[PDB]
Design a protein around this ligand. Structure first.
Ligand SMILES: [Cl-]
Ligand SMILES: [Cl-]
Ligand SMILES: [Cl-]
Ligand SMILES: [Cl-]
Ligand SMILES: [Cl-]
Length: 859
């Protein structure tokens, strides 16, 4: 109790009493932020992602299937939901099941994007953990593992289902093949998992132009009672199709026949549809408002969109356009001889592999003219690269080639013959090396102009500043082609993408140039036709690669491929479930959500307080200069070791854009662990809770007594109840006088704190005991007043709680009457939470947390 700490002669500093109150004030305001758990993640503020996170992340025991189109943010939405439920206390134990080849990607993603360190569980980890616990999976709160690891023994899968996970995440759930009569031994292991875990997130793809029926096998796992018969689900999807068609006619700018519109009327099962129905269709002045309320009611009756989210690249805006630039170069004679040697020596090998050689002329001239053959002197592609680079020196250029060997040789030549700064970015590099290259390439104007990448890594960091891409060569299959473009074709880029493809005339590359552009239209547009056509055309296309000399018969392959492309394109556009796409991307409300967070992101109090907090704790803050502070410990640190700090130091940034370019730095927000740790460090300890201070004011009597009192109103409830939305620990300042009159409302904290000053150890010590009978008599005066202020907070909180928590229960009740996806558990959870919160609010108390004594002098 802080007064007994001050009575008994413990007098802390006056700048630590200042930080302590600011911390309780700031923490209180942030707990109540509307979009808590949605600001600390190291991502762009993309609406369609944020919509899913907000919708799903706030549910209780969420069970969802994320089927967003590839490249839309399936894994980002997954981590956001995790970040929300973990920060809100809704979840504590999480299990992510990933194919082993993807385990490392998830480990780094969850750590750098969401500040979540998962423990990877392999056989080694599992064995050493069997000794440490009855259930091996009780030793870690957050665990990644593979389904093959999970399925190894039966005794192992039993421990997993008994580990009491709050949430489960399964990546690539489409690899789970399921027959109604014969489920695979893998599908049987997951269904057993999804039955022992309340919340379940399923990430999947719906490729090869199939319908939502393929999803039933997984939808069956989320809500087994809603989805219990396959055929009925098929019947439903066929019968829902006309509405989607008619809906698709409306917003496209068509008139809707009355016969058509009495199928939309059947979907929304009401009787007063007609007046609202026609204004949206007659195109009167307010047809805009009649369409938007019309569509909204339609979505609430959709059979799956509440439990299935599928954003397409057509239902989402923001992606940059992609423009192509092709350059036809003379095939140098040194290669012509080099390939004919492979021709003769290529006696016994399939056209499949014969064509694999013809792809890269550079790397067969290194087998017949000896390794390291100086191919960088006659190859026109190199000449074009230099010329292009030296002419656009102020542009960041991503240069992608097939193999790392060619990339390393290119770096050396661009450096040693044109003074071009170029970092190599291949997969063999470690994580620190790639960060080093990404940093150099991200330097605004003094760093690497070029990033020479081997066949690109799979969906790593964002080069939002780069808008130019060069294809030094082209891969065989069209999936890697779209993957290369993927590192740039993302929401949040600076400008549109310019693709430059310098290709040697009359070679396998020249073939792939025409096939990709004329046939599949794969460079400038994103329609996923490539793979289907690639399979239907393989053996023909191969021969034109293994021998680009035989040119006749080719030009018809191209128009045949483009015919397939347009046909495949057409079939997909007519399969769009535009209702599901609008519900997935969140619509207009979601873009509004994205901008509120974009505005909270300029919090300067956060940076000022962080500097203030870090400095008190004793953390040296060297400002390197480019919006990045380097934090290092000191001899004057206040604690043995701080959770996040290491002696080698850490880089931090408060700017969301710098963070996206420098993933090696910590993105500092109110939700970042550094702040939450330092906050707890102060407010858990009791330093800064009791001090004395002198005031120099000519306009007051000597020896007058002001007592600054920081009470704290608190509720005692498990964090699972989320009381912090309505009543977190909230400070109540009071500046009492000798008669118990409160002045705090008139005397703001900062200005008052400015004009105050401390004492020396001795004089202050008994200066307190000079009025120990007085200050003690001052406290009970406020004791009767704090209870008035305390009950004021409680009552307002109970109003704010009962208001919002009943509004949510009403909405869920409205949906259950109109939608089949609302579970019994959901409505029960809200009801149980409303009662428990109002109960925990009726039991809130107050306490004296901090106390600063004031004595006026005129000396
Ligand atoms: Cl201060
Ligand atoms: Cl695998
Ligand atoms: Cl899997
Ligand atoms: Cl397209
Ligand atoms: Cl708790």
């Amino acid at each position: 109790k802080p007064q007994d700490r001050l009575f008994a002669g413990q007098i802390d500093r006056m700048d630590r009493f200042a930080l302590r109150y600011r911390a309780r004030k700031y923490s209180s305001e942030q707990f109540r932020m509307p979009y808590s758990g949605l600001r600390g993640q190291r991502t762009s503020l993309i609406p369609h992602q944020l919509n899913i996170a907000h919708d799903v992340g706030r549910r209780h025991a969420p069970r969802v299937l994320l089927a967003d189109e590839v490249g839309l943010g399936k894994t980002i939405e997954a981590g956001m939901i995790l970040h929300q439920q973990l920060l809100s206390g809704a979840a504590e134990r999480v299990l992510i099941i990933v194919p082993e080849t993807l385990q490392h990607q998830w480990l780094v993603e969850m750590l750098r994007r969401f500040n979540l360190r998962f423990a990877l569980f392999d056989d080694e980890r599992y064995a050493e953990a069997q000794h440490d616990a009855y259930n091996p999976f009780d030793t870690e709160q957050l665990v990644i593992c593979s389904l093959d690891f999970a399925r190894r023994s039966k005794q192992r899968l039993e421990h997993l289902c008994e580990a009491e996970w709050d949430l489960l995440v399964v990546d690539e759930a489409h690899h789970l093949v399921w027959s109604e009569d014969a489920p695979s031994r893998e599908y049987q292991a997951i269904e057993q998992l999804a039955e022992h875990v309340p919340g379940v997130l399923l990430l999947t793809a719906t490729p090869e132009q199939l319908g939502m029926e393929s999803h039933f096998a997984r939808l069956r796992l989320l809500d087994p009672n809603r989805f219990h018969d396959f055929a009925q689900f098929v019947e439903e999807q066929k019968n829902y199709r006309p509405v989607a068609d008619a809906v698709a006619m409306l917003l496209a700018g068509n008139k809707l026949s009355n016969d058509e519109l009495n199928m939309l009327g059947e979907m929304i099962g009401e009787q007063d549809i007609e007046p609202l129905l026609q204004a949206a269709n007659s195109d009167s002045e307010d047809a805009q408002s009649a369409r938007q309320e019309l569509v909204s009611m339609l979505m609430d009756r959709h059979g799956t969109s509440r439990v299935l989210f599928r954003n397409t690249r057509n239902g989402v805006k923001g992606f940059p356009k992609r423009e192509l630039h092709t350059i036809k170069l003379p095939l140098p004679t040194q290669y012509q001889t080099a390939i004919k040697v492979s021709g003769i020596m290529g006696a016994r090998k399939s056209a499949e592999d014969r064509a694999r050689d013809m792809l890269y002329p550079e790397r067969i001239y290194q087998e017949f003219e000896g390794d390291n053959a100086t191919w960088w002197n006659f190859d026109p592609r190199v000449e074009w690269l230099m010329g292009y680079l030296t002419s656009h020196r102020s542009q960041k250029v991503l240069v992608i080639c097939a193999k790392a060997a060619t990339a390393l040789q290119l770096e050396q030549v661009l450096r040693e013959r044109e003074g071009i700064r170029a970092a190599v970015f291949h997969e063999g590099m470690s994580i620190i090396e790639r960060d080093r290259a990404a940093a150099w390439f991200a330097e605004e104007d003094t760093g690497a102009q070029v990033l020479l990448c081997s066949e690109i890594g799979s969906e790593g960091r964002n080069f939002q500043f780069a808008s130019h891409m060069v294809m030094f060569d082209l891969p065989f299959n069209p999936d890697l082609l779209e993957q290369r473009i993927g590192r740039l074709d993302r929401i949040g880029q600076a400008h549109d993408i310019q693709i430059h493809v310098p290709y040697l005339e009359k070679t396998a590359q020249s073939v792939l140039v025409r096939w990709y552009h004329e046939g599949l239209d794969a460079f400038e547009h994103t329609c996923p036709t490539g793979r289907t056509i690639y399979d239907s055309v393989y053996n023909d296309l191969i021969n034109y690669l293994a021998s680009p000399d035989q040119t006749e018969g080719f030009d018809d392959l191209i128009k045949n491929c483009r015919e397939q492309h347009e046909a495949l394109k057409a079939q997909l556009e007519q399969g769009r479930d535009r209702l599901l796409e609008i519900h997935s991307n969140g619509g207009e409300k979601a873009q509004a959500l994205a901008e509120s967070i974009e505005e909270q992101d300029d919090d300067t109090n956060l940076i000022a307080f962080a500097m203030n907090l870090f400095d008190i704790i004793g953390i040296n803050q060297d400002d390197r200069g480019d919006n990045m502070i380097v934090l290092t410990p000191s001899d004057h640190m206040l604690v043995p070791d701080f959770p996040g700090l290491s002696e080698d130091g850490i880089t931090i940034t408060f700017d969301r854009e710098v963070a996206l370019a420098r993933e090696d730095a910590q993105f500092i927000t109110w939700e970042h662990p550094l702040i939450r740790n330092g906050l707890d460090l102060i407010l858990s300890g009791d330093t800064g809770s009791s001090t004395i201070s002198l005031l120099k004011n000519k306009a007051l009597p000597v020896g007058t007594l002001l007592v600054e009192l920081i009470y704290v109103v608190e509720a005692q409830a498990p964090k699972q109840l989320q009381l912090n939305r309505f009543l977190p620990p909230t400070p109540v300042r009071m500046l009492l006088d000798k008669n118990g009159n409160n002045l705090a409302a008139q005397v703001e904290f900062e200005t008052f704190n400015r004009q105050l000053n401390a004492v020396n150890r001795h004089t202050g010590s008994k200066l307190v005991n000079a009025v120990q009978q007085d200050v003690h008599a001052i406290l009970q005066l406020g004791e009767a007043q704090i209870e008035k202020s305390a009950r004021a907070l409680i009552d307002a909180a109970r109003n704010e709680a009962d208001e919002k928590l009943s509004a949510e229960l009403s909405r869920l009740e409205a949906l259950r009457a109109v939608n089949p996806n609302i579970r019994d558990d959901e409505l029960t959870a809200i009801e149980s939470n409303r009662q428990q919160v109002m109960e925990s609010l009726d039991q809130a108390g107050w306490r004296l947390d901090a106390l600063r004594l004031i004595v006026v002098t005129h000396q």
